[PDB]
Amino acid sequence: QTHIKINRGELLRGIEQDHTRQLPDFRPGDTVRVDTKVREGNRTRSQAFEGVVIAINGSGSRKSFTVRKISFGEGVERVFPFASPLVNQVTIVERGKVRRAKLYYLRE
Amino acid sequence: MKGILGTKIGMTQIWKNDRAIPVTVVLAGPCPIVQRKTAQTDGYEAVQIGYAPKAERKVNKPMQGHFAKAGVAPTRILREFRGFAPDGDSVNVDIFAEGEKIDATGTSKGKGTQGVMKRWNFAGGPASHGSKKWHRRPGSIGQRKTPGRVYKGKRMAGHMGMERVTVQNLEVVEIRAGENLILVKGAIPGANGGLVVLRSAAKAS
Amino acid sequence: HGKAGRKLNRNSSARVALARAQATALLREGRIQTTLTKAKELRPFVEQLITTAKGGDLHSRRLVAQDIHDKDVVRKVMDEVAPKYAERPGGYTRILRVGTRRGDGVTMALIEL
Amino acid sequence: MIMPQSRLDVADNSGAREIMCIRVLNSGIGGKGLTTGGGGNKRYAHVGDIIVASVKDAAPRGAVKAGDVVKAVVVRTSHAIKRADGSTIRFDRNAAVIINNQGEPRGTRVFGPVARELRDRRFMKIVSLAPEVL
Amino acid sequence: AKHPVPKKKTSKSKRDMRRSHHALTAPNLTECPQCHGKKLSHHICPNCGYYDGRQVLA
RNA sequence: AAGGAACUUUGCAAUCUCACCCCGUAACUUCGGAAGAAGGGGUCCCCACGCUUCGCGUGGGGCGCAGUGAAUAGGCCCAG
RNA sequence: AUUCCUUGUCGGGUAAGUUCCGACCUGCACGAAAGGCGUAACGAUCUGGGCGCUGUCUCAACGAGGGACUCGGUGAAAUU
RNA sequence: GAUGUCGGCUCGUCGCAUCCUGGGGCUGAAGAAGGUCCCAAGGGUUGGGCUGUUCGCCCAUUAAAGCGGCACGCGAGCUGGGUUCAGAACGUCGUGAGACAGUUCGGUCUCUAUCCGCUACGGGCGCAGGAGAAUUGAGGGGAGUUGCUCCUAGUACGAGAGGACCGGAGUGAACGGACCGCUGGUCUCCCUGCUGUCGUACCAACGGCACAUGCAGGGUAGCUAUGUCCGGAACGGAUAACCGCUGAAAGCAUCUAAGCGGGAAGCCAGCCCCAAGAUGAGUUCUCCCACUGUUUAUCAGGUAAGACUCCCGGAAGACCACCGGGUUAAGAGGCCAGGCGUGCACGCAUAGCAAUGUGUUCAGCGGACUGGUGCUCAUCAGUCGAGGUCUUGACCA
Numbered sequence A: 001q002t003h004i005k006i007n008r009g010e011l012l013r014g015i016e017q018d019h020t021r022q023l024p025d026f027r028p029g030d031t032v033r034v035d036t037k038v039r040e041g042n043r044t045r046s047q048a049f050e051g052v053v054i055a056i057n058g059s060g061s062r063k064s065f066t067v068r069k070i071s072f073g074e075g076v077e078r079v080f081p082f083a084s085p086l087v088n089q090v091t092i093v094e095r096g097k098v099r100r101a102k103l104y105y106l107r108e
Numbered sequence B: 001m002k003g004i005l006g007t008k009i010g011m012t013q014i015w016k017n018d019r020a021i022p023v024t025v026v027l028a029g030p031c032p033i034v035q036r037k038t039a040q041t042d043g044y045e046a047v048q049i050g051y052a053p054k055a056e057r058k059v060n061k062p063m064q065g066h067f068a069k070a071g072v073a074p075t076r077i078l079r080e081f082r083g084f085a086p087d088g089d090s091v092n093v094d095i096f097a098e099g100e101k102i103d104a105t106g107t108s109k110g111k112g113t114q115g116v117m118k119r120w121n122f123a124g125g126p127a128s129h130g131s132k133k134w135h136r137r138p139g140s141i142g143q144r145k146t147p148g149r150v151y152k153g154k155r156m157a158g159h160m161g162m163e164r165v166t167v168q169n170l171e172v173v174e175i176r177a178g179e180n181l182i183l184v185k186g187a188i189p190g191a192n193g194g195l196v197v198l199r200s201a202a203k204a205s
Numbered sequence C: 001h002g003k004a005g006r007k008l009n010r011n012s013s014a015r016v017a018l019a020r021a022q023a024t025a026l027l028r029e030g031r032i033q034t035t036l037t038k039a040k041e042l043r044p045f046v047e048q049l050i051t052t053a054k055g056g057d058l059h060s061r062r063l064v065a066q067d068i069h070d071k072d073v074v075r076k077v078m079d080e081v082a083p084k085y086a087e088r089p090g091g092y093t094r095i096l097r098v099g100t101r102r103g104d105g106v107t108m109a110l111i112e113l
Numbered sequence D: 001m002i003m004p005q006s007r008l009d010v011a012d013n014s015g016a017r018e019i020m021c022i023r024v025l026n027s028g029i030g031g032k033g034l035t036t037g038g039g040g041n042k043r044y045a046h047v048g049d050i051i052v053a054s055v056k057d058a059a060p061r062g063a064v065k066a067g068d069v070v071k072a073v074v075v076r077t078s079h080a081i082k083r084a085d086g087s088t089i090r091f092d093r094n095a096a097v098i099i100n101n102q103g104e105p106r107g108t109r110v111f112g113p114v115a116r117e118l119r120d121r122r123f124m125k126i127v128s129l130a131p132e133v134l
Numbered sequence E: 001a002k003h004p005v006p007k008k009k010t011s012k013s014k015r016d017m018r019r020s021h022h023a024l025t026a027p028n029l030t031e032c033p034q035c036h037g038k039k040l041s042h043h044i045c046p047n048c049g050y051y052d053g054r055q056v057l058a
Numbered sequence F: 001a002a003g004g005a006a007c008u009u010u011g012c013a014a015u016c017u018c019a020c021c022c023c024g025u026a027a028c029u030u031c032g033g034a035a036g037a038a039g040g041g042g043u044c045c046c047c048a049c050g051c052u053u054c055g056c057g058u059g060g061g062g063c064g065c066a067g068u069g070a071a072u073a074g075g076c077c078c079a080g
Numbered sequence G: 001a002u003u004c005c006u007u008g009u010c011g012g013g014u015a016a017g018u019u020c021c022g023a024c025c026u027g028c029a030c031g032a033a034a035g036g037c038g039u040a041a042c043g044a045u046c047u048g049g050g051c052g053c054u055g056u057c058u059c060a061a062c063g064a065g066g067g068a069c070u071c072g073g074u075g076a077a078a079u080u
Numbered sequence H: 001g002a003u004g005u006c007g008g009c010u011c012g013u014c015g016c017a018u019c020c021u022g023g024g025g026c027u028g029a030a031g032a033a034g035g036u037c038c039c040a041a042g043g044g045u046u047g048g049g050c051u052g053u054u055c056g057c058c059c060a061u062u063a064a065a066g067c068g069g070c071a072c073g074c075g076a077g078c079u080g081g082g083u084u085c086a087g088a089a090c091g092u093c094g095u096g097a098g099a100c101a102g103u104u105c106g107g108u109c110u111c112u113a114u115c116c117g118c119u120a121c122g123g124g125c126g127c128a129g130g131a132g133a134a135u136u137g138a139g140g141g142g143a144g145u146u147g148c149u150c151c152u153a154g155u156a157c158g159a160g161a162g163g164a165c166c167g168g169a170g171u172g173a174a175c176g177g178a179c180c181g182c183u184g185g186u187c188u189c190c191c192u193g194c195u196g197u198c199g200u201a202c203c204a205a206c207g208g209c210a211c212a213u214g215c216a217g218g219g220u221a222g223c224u225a226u227g228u229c230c231g232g233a234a235c236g237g238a239u240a241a242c243c244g245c246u247g248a249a250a251g252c253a254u255c256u257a258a259g260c261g262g263g264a265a266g267c268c269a270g271c272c273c274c275a276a277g278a279u280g281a282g283u284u285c286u287c288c289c290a291c292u293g294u295u296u297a298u299c300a301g302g303u304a305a306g307a308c309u310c311c312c313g314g315a316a317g318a319c320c321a322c323c324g325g326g327u328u329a330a331g332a333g334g335c336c337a338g339g340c341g342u343g344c345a346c347g348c349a350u351a352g353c354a355a356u357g358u359g360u361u362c363a364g365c366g367g368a369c370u371g372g373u374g375c376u377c378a379u380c381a382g383u384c385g386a387g388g389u390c391u392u393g394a395c396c397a
């Protein structure tokens, strides 16, 4: 509609960079994702979500990864923004051999 | 009152404290002041601002004169902002401030002809218990012999979208002047690379 | 709305056959007269085949062989045409509009390499 | 997203094994016990929401028996729950914990992990017996 | 029978009135630069077969 | 997605089931039946050995989300 | 498939059951080859329930194809 | 010489004799909870089980789960469960053929809208020259709901139990608009895997067919809700019931007969959207400038400013319209780089008898995404478009 000579790509890339975090290599196979539970009152707690990486999705600010784990007999899937402040550090626990990019079949 | 013209750039994810904020990146570029409208000359108080630069060749003589009378250098868009004065040539610096609630207005992405279901919400009909009128089709357009008419204003299928929409009390999250950028919490109407009009909150809460 | 991008006046199977058929014809003949639209649609697909062939290795041939089922045409594109377009920064294929036909009143056009 | 007719797992040893949603309420919890509804509509129950339910199957021997009309708070959902930082949680099966008109559990134990949202929704006792709070 | 049907014959006036928009638009024919026999804008000249140089046969 | 008959006159419609082999199988009965009851498992590729062949059986190994890998292809039960 | 009063009354099932099953008897107006009562099996019969599954539904979305829309060619109709 | 009939659904709108919210008066009104009457139609008025049901009873909620009109609103909008055709059975009646106050199972609901009306979209001419833009708002429409919690304050009130008005914070539910960043859905050939068979001579590697994707796994842009963001307001002006001020008639008294103030979710304005065909056709800025044509051609013809036609496209769109580009060019395509999707290519080498595995290889492929770049086509042109009526008045040399 307004025909301004603009590279929206870079304008966006510009904003997103001060909100983008690089994490260890990780493609599937196990990860201890140590997250911080600030909300437990005014007190800041520490929890650790460890399980298989089922998906990796997005780029820049929007980049995320999905971790699946069986905890107390019931299945749990958690999705994390790489650049989330409540995420402290992700750590590769054991590298996995996989033939695809999504792993959703592991849900059965 | 206060106002600016810009181009919707896009939507991204940002964090302020620990909370993730959906932001709409807007280029509220420099807006030259092209005409001042006074009660003495125009009968009302307002300002004509301009937005995207136009190649001199592409501009016609009538627009050349109008731009020359203010020594501006052709824009492409020209909008008026009522009860707004501040001297010089309008930029977001001190016009807007982080935290300010604003009223961003654009032109909704137009969706051509749309049925009463998509356009008015409707309900359509049964998918199975014997139809002909399966999903979209409105019901009864009226009554019987009394108003031999169908009510004026009746909700019916038509051209949906490509309309003026003002979204109220949007929060100002970040401002990068010189980069001529302004981040707004939430979604502004219209498509990327479209004209937006950022004004001071119409009636702030 | 409908802000997608490509054409299809037939069904999946056919839309492919047509593109591959007109791609084989232009490369066989060098110039073909067809409906303006069918010509507009053909342009990117054949231009893409020239770039694949510009590789000049087995893999590049076999990739052409996937859309060019005529053995002689694949050799022509591989060893004759792609080489000629070495320094052409992929552009060549041009469209010329001829004019309206009798039976359907359709504006015909030319597509030459 | 739980609506009437939705059958769900019981995350307690109250006696019930499966409850079937009868009604989704506006999940009160203020001083006097559970607060009166925040409307008569309200489509879906999420985690931290209070539902009225019919007990479709119970274990032999235990406080809650089959056919009884009970109140339960949703503790797990297959429908994803979003958080303030932008993270998401989702559980393989949806589950609830039977409560009294005070909002306190009817069983002595909570089974499986529970949504942190129950804590924000002021369900201390439930959170208290929960083996994990994700 | 044939469900909605017209209630009255439409007058000679009425019928012709809807015809106000049927009038064809004559082509914008241009003189050809190198055989002069008229051509359509952006099309190859039918007579000489030129489009700067001669593109088509005859 | 989540939910699963809340649809409705009525699960109308559409899913689910779906072949062959092994295991297994209720009330009731006119002793034939009910029965494909119900329910479970197998199914591809290679190699070795055994055998009645197109083959099949044991054993070890391989690959994919998935092996009647596409097509043909029972949903079942209780009571009147 | 017979009951007017009638959604009879108690029980079952359901969160909730004008239907359905079971008793009861007050059979408007059952009843013994215009056969009475029962019966395994059979049924594109009719009725009520359950499991399974599902866009029937909350609540609809996206996608495809053929029409509808546009141009060239041919060009009807009931009605008035 | 035909005005289709119960119930459902769909879609609405209206009355108020108001179900909820809003304002009041009386109370056998301490407070909290109420009863009753007055004003009040702005919005709102839930999901199920039973029955063809309207109704009604029940479950579970709610601020409330209002009553009625619109051919018992609505079948050229849908259903077809009820009822009223032909079949068949039961109970009853008739000697019978048959019948019903009944009951029961079954049973063809007709592709094309002419006018008016309604939603959307253009073409024409007008608006005293011809043009390109920016507008004022006469008028019109949209919207209008409400809970819970806290604070005030455990205060007023009450012996206690209990427990406020008024004012002030939050936070939801339903509904609406927008939007696609997120979570997801889809994404008919963008990537992979799989079967049978046929073909590219064979092997290897591919292609068709198995759907109008053969099947499976995943999936960008786009579109999307079940996902986000915002919204209903505040202030005001005039009022309703009602509460008062000054106050006679009627030396007193009285809100009323003169005059005055207050006072509702209602009215008018404010918010969002349309709007000068507002023939009462408005305002402002800028441009072009006062051509030429025989008493044969009576006003046509070259033209200006400007636009149209045509081409290439588009988060615009049925068509038309709208926006951009059209070589003085980055408009689209290609091509290059990048993103992203798929997930390790062919070919070779090695290991194994082999099926396969490993390396080369974060590989190969490639729709729609973000830039760059003159390789392709936007070539060449044609059509149209002012020279400004008269009257009166003020200023002018």
Ligand SMILES: CC[C@H]1OC(=O)[C@H](C)[C@@H](OC(=O)N2C=CC[C@@H]2c2ccc(NC(C)=O)cc2)[C@H](C)[C@@H](O[C@@H]2O[C@H](C)C[C@H](N(C)C)[C@H]2O)[C@](C)(OC)C[C@@H](C)C(=O)[C@H](C)[C@H]2NC(=O)O[C@@]21C
Residues within 6 Å of the ligand: E001, H002, H004, H080, H109, H110
């Ligand atoms: C399919 C096309 C054919 O039309 C037809 O069959 C349709 C279905 C019939 O519709 C109907 O019966 N209904 C339509 C509305 C109600 C009724 C109806 C009523 C009860 C039920 N019950 C259930 C539960 O199902 C079903 C339908 C038509 C329209 C009949 O007309 C209706 O007659 C009623 C007596 C009086 C109605 N009005 C006046 C009130 C009038 O509308 C009729 C008799 O034709 C049968 C006309 C003559 C002209 C013809 O014979 C033409 C030539 C047909 N012949 C041919 O082949 O074409 C046709 C047009």
Ligand SMILES: [Mg+2]
Residues within 6 Å of the ligand: A057
């Ligand atoms: Mg995803």
Ligand SMILES: [Mg+2]
Residues within 6 Å of the ligand: B123, B124, B125, B135
């Ligand atoms: Mg629907």
Ligand SMILES: [Mg+2]
Residues within 6 Å of the ligand: none
């Ligand atoms: Mg019996």
Ligand SMILES: [Mg+2]
Residues within 6 Å of the ligand: none
């Ligand atoms: Mg038979």
Ligand SMILES: [Mg+2]
Residues within 6 Å of the ligand: none
């Ligand atoms: Mg035609």
Ligand SMILES: [Mg+2]
Residues within 6 Å of the ligand: H005
């Ligand atoms: Mg009738």
Ligand SMILES: [Mg+2]
Residues within 6 Å of the ligand: none
């Ligand atoms: Mg009608």
Ligand SMILES: [Mg+2]
Residues within 6 Å of the ligand: none
């Ligand atoms: Mg997505």
Ligand SMILES: [Mg+2]
Residues within 6 Å of the ligand: none
């Ligand atoms: Mg797929």
Ligand SMILES: [Mg+2]
Residues within 6 Å of the ligand: H262
């Ligand atoms: Mg007042």
Ligand SMILES: [Mg+2]
Residues within 6 Å of the ligand: none
């Ligand atoms: Mg142009």
Ligand SMILES: [Mg+2]
Residues within 6 Å of the ligand: none
């Ligand atoms: Mg590009």
